[PDB]
Ligand binder design. Structure first.
Ligand SMILES: Cc1cc2nc3c(=O)[nH]c(=O)nc-3n(C[C@H](O)[C@H](O)[C@H](O)COP(=O)(O)OP(=O)(O)OC[C@H]3O[C@@H](n4cnc5c(N)ncnc54)[C@H](O)[C@@H]3O)c2cc1C
Length: 435
């Protein structure tokens, strides 16, 4: 390392895409760098695994060239993408089920989106520059997704389809999710609903998200310690002392790249600013269910919508991954784990009956990101007021403590792309700070 009295120039706490991108950035600047990771693996809220004979993504999955950082890195390393999924759309409204060819359902849904998203260009004309229209964003940031929904002249059917979509975006009940965050997704999709569909659930890395993570790691020169939860971070004038459950490590600068819902799992000295305290106490809105379901039947390429609260089914959305000769692989989301145990095959089979009657579930699994102490929640969509109250102060360095993550990115906050974007600029600021 450069200076005396430290073990490292840079310690990165957390080895998701954000921490790994920051550690590549720091170590390729010639800084002696260590990643401290609490789990037995790198990847964080991305986790490539297996379900039956299928390679699956238990967390973060889909990517697009609307996402500058992850698309840059995909091409950087010569990786390929393939496609997930629609023929028919099934939706619940007033606790009744309808189905129709996809284009007909999209006539109703798109007309609703036309109304729901009409202010997005006014609030985020530069989506990677959150506060370019600070005052207009401030005017609406108090609104939840449900609040804005109740202001619109839509049919109940249109409102029910939006409820499904909005709940799907934030992974929670619509009243918990910032309306402005809904506008952000649309703005990042170039104010075009088909581009939004393509960006958030279509293309995936052929060799898995883990192949990109390892490419980034292998391009750096950083050390790694796995299965090493950090318990204390202590900063003085000259260095940072990081206490873990298996060793003490010092650095001239530390990048805290943990999910914001786990900020209070670490003990900090001096204490952190009110923005970190409040965000870590309030959490972002992402707290739902994601699972993979195997049904014996061939149901084709379906996509389903249902409100977060309905009498028929706990799933806000179910859609075909691919059809097979063992049946259909479905992907299913719910707003609330209390509504369905995604690993209970019988519970799940009953949950699907209103949408795909007679279907037989042979396998069902979802990773529990909510109870995993190293995530405590799913992807990050802010709650009302959080963007304008906390984003900038959340991003800020405090002495020798820097902060990184998709949970605080400027652009595709809540996505793999946001983690890489934020990790790369924070790692560069650290390199600059260390001169
Ligand atoms: C179910 C689900 C599906 C998703 N699907 C998509 C998708 O399709 N497309 C998309 O773009 N994004 C998706 N996302 C979002 C994406 O997965 C995340 O935004 C991203 O992976 C997180 O990057 P990060 O490095 O900022 O955070 P994390 O991956 O959470 O990095 C945090 C890391 O730090 C570690 N850590 C935490 N606390 C400590 C501690 N005290 N000591 C040591 N280590 C610690 C954690 O174990 C973890 O390895 C999804 C998220 C979820 C939950």
């Amino acid at each position: 390392p450069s200076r005396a009295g430290v073990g490292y120039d840079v310690i990165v706490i957390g080895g998701g895409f954000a921490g790994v991108t920051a550690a590549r950035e720091a170590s390729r600047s010639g800084l002696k760098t260590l990643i401290l990771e609490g789990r037995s693996r790198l990847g964080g809220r991305t986790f490539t695994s297996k379900l039956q004979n299928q390679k699956v993504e238990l967390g973060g999955t889909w990517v697009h060239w609307t996402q500058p950082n992850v698309w840059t890195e995909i091409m950087h390393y010569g990786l390929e993408v393939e496609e997930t999924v629609p023929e028919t759309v099934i939706w619940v409204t007033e606790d009744n089920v309808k189905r129709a060819p996809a284009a007909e359902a999209f006539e109703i849904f798109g007309s609703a989106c036309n109304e729901y998203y009409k202010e997005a260009r006014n609030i985020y004309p530069r989506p990677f520059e959150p506060f370019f229209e600070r005052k207009k964003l401030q005017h609406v940031d108090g609104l939840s997704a449900a609040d804005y929904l109740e202001k619109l002249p839509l049919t109940r059917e249109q409102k029910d389809m939006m409820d499904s979509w909005l709940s799907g975006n934030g992974h929670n009940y619509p009243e918990t999710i910032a309306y402005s965050e809904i506008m952000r997704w649309f703005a990042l999709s170039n104010f075009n609903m088909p581009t939004m569909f393509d960006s958030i659930a279509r293309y995936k890395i052929k060799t898995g998200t883990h192949s990109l993570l390892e490419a980034i790691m292998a391009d750096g020169n950083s050390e790694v310690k796995l299965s090493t939860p950090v318990t204390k971070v202590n900063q003085d004038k000259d260095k940072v002392t990081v206490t873990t459950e298996d060793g003490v490590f010092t650095a001239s600068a530390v990048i805290v790249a943990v999910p914001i819902n786990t900020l209070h799992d670490i003990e900090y000295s001096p204490k952190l600013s009110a923005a970190k305290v409040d965000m870590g106490s309030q959490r972002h809105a992402g707290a739902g269910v994601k699972g993979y379901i195997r049904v014996a039947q061939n149901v084709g390429n379906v996509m389903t919508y249902a409100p977060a609260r309905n009498k028929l089914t706990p799933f806000t959305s179910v859609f075909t991954d691919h059809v097979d000769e063992a049946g259909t692989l479905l992907i299913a989301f719910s707003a609330d784990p209390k509504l369905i145990d995604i690993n209970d095959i019988k519970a799940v089979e009953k949950a699907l009956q209103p949408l795909l009657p007679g279907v037989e579930v042979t396998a069902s699994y979802g990773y529990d990101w909510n109870l995993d102490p190293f995530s405590k929640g799913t992807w990050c969509t802010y709650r009302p007021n959080q963007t304008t109250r906390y984003l900038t102060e959340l991003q800020k360095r405090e002495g020798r403590l820097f902060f990184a993550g998709s949970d605080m990115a400027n652009g595709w906050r809540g996505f793999i792309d946001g983690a890489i974007e934020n990790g790369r600029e924070v790692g560069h600021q650290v390199a600059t700070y260390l001169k």
